[PDB]
């Protein structure tokens, strides 16, 4: 006989971490039997309704208006409700707390069903099963692909949670040649583990670039010859905006679909610059950083990682910054490791010559 307690009210989230959540609550009516224990329940989009959770203390006594839930899933939206129990029974569940997501850590699972094969001429196709949302454990989720025909790994960061494929197109890929491949995941907090190395097979002259020097006709690369040639209209000199560089690319290579531009990572000595509006041109050499004309969908560069070296990548969704800035980030990130910047590439375009991240390789310095 008698009556169970009432439902508690005012479920607060006092503090929340990657696996824990501290809760406070107002005691409901006990109906004249002292409350003996409080129990907590939690609901997520992946929890099959409401489920019981563990706490520290293991049992929450009736004189406690606060406890901490443990063993929660990182990067998952949570809501909690408290139940009041006495010698008669267990009262009705409380109204849920305001939804709050647990904080993040590095992913712990590896991408499933890594595989590959097929594709078009001189391609290597790598595939995997995207990591489900509940197992991503954080924002900025992506994948790192590692493959090799050799001891150096070839690696690229693929910054898209739902990406399931990576296609390496390079003319040095032999047809139907064996490749070892492993894939791992990452997020804002760091790297996940790589999965097992498996074997896949591949499928059965110069890059478009423009260069500028104010007062002189723009130069561009001849894709076939590989030689630098002047502006075909004989009138266009340096442009004022990065979008202007993109437009000049599209004018110079009409057979291509130009979608972005980015500074080349190294300067090049270009011969035979000609002054604008000069009927006769005494050629001159100039060392400039040219702009690569990027085509089609953006694909992260593949970076060779010699076995002495290490592959890193950083991205941030809160800032969209330039190629020169990411270069300084990668370069300093490796002097702070007492190493040298070997190579680097842009991740995640967010504007014309502006990116959300960079990948880079760092090596010990070569000296006697």
Residue numbers in the entry: 597 to 745, 748 to 802, 1036 to 1199
Q: Paper's wording?
A:
Contactins (CNTNs) are neural cell adhesion molecules that encode axon-target specificity during the patterning of the vertebrate visual and olfactory systems. Because CNTNs are tethered to the plasma membrane by a glycosylphosphatidylinositol anchor, they lack an intracellular region to communicate across the membrane. Instead, they form coreceptor complexes with distinct transmembrane proteins to transmit signals inside the cell. Finally, structural analyses of five CNTN–amyloid pairs indicate that these proteins interact through a conserved interface involving the second fibronectin type III repeat of CNTNs and the copper-binding domain of amyloid proteins.
